[PDB]
Curated annotation (Swiss-Prot):
Presence of the UniProt keyword Repeat in the record: yes
Keywords: Metal-binding, Nucleus, Repeat, Transcription, Transcription regulation, Zinc, Zinc-finger
Sequence repeat feature ranges: 54-130
Family the entry assigns: Belongs to the TFIIB family.
Residues in coiled coil: none
Superkingdom: Eukaryota
The organism of origin for this protein: Saccharomyces cerevisiae (strain ATCC 204508 / S288c)
Entry protein name: Transcription initiation factor IIB
GO MF terms held by the record: RNA polymerase II complex binding; RNA polymerase II complex recruiting activity; RNA polymerase II general transcription initiation factor activity; TBP-class protein binding; zinc ion binding
UniProt subunit comment: Associates with TFIID-IIA (DA complex) to form TFIID-IIA-IIB (DAB-complex) which is then recognized by polymerase II.
Any one annotated GO CC term: transcription preinitiation complex
Function: General factor that plays a major role in the activation of eukaryotic genes transcribed by RNA polymerase II.
Amino acid sequence: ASILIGCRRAEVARTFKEIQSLIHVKTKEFGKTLNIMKNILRGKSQNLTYIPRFCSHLGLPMQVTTSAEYTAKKCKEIKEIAGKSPITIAVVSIYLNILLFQIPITAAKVGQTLQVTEGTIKSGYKILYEHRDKLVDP
DNA sequence: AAAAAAAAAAGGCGCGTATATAAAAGTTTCAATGTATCTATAAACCTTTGATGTGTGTTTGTACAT
């Protein structure tokens, strides 16, 4: 966690699974340890980071990533709490925007590359195949 | 061409993700303690090898038949 602290506190945010890949922490000993730790400094006293690191993991040009910052922020800004650990609803912006482009990143390839449920995608994409109205920049 | 068995396939059961509440029982993990088991190691013997007083040995002088 002090890494996840040290990471996020250094303005680089990584998912719990990502560190879990580095160290298997039973995903639970992580959580309780984090809460105290954060409050350790508070007494001693940001999911945006995920959009680009994902695009590169798929090897995409900047525009597809460029757009998602607008889309995810705009999808976040109005409504759609949408997600229970917004890690997922980040990726759907790529999926939203990758389909706005025509580049083969077929859902199955997305999943294992980013180790995400496929179900959260399409249902997450439900709120997108309907919200396709206001993301028109050009 | 027809009969029988397993898979293709999904949605949901039902509690892992938190999650704090508290008691109730028990486990495992950690560390001090105890012990036979490696090892060197210097202190045991045995043998070796260089230095060593000296038993035997070359000159002096001898009672002693010859």
